[PDB]
C-alpha cells in the first residue's frame, strides 16, 4: 500500500475520480523512483483498454507523456542521470527542445510510444519548485484525437488541484 508513503492519497484519489469523470478515460498519478515511473494510483478503464500502466508497478522514466513531463520539470543533474543510464544523450536538440517545449505548455502529449494505439497526456504535479508527480491520461489515439483539447484542459486542472 501506498498509505504511509504516499501523504496526499486521499486527494490524489478524489482528482483521479473526477478527472475520468469529466474525460471518460483512465487516469493515474505517477512518481519518479530512479530510473523509473511508479504508478501509485489508477482509476482503470471503464472500457476494455489494456495498456502498459499497471497501479504499484513501474516503468522506465524515458518514453511516454508521464516520463517527459517527469524529465522536463525534475532538476538537470536528476533528468541527465536517467536519460545517460538508458543510453541517451540529454544534450540533443530532440531531448533539449521537447523539455522546452513542455515548460512553455505545461504539460507533454504523446502518441503510441508505449502501446501501440494508445496516447499519454500528462501534467506535473509540483510542491513549490520541487516535482512530485505526474497526472495522467491514458486513451485510445481514437478518442484523443476527438478529445485532445478537453483531455489536456482537464489533466492540467486535475495536476493544479494537487
Ligand atoms: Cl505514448
Ligand atoms: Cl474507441
Not at 55 to 79: D, E, F, I, N, T
Request: hydrophobic residues 40%; contains cysteine; glycine residues 6%.
Amino acid at each position: 500500500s501506498y498509505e504511509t508513503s504516499q501523504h496526499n492519497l486521499d486527494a490524489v484519489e478524489a482528482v483521479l475520480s473526477r478527472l475520468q469523470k469529466q474525460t471518460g478515460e483512465m487516469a493515474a498519478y505517477m512518481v519518479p523512483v530512479g530510473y523509473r515511473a511508479l504508478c501509485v494510483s489508477q482509476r482503470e478503464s471503464m472500457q476494455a483498454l489494456r495498456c502498459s500502466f499497471v497501479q504499484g508497478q513501474s516503468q522506465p522514466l524515458l518514453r511516454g507523456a508521464s516520463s517527459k513531463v517527469m524529465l522536463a520539470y525534475m532538476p538537470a543533474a536528476r533528468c541527465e542521470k536517467i536519460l545517460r543510464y538508458f543510453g541517451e544523450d540529454p544534450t540533443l536538440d530532440k531531448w533539449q527542445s521537447e523539455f522546452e517545449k513542455i515548460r512553455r505548455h505545461g504539460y507533454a502529449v504523446s502518441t503510441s510510444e508505449i502501446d501501440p494505439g494508445v496516447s499519454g497526456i500528462s501534467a506535473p504535479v509540483m510542491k513549490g519548485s520541487k516535482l512530485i508527480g505526474a497526472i495522467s491520461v491514458m486513451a485510445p489515439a481514437h478518442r484523443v484525437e476527438s478529445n485532445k483539447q478537453r483531455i489536456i484542459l482537464h489533466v492540467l486542472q486535475a495536476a493544479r488541484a494537487l
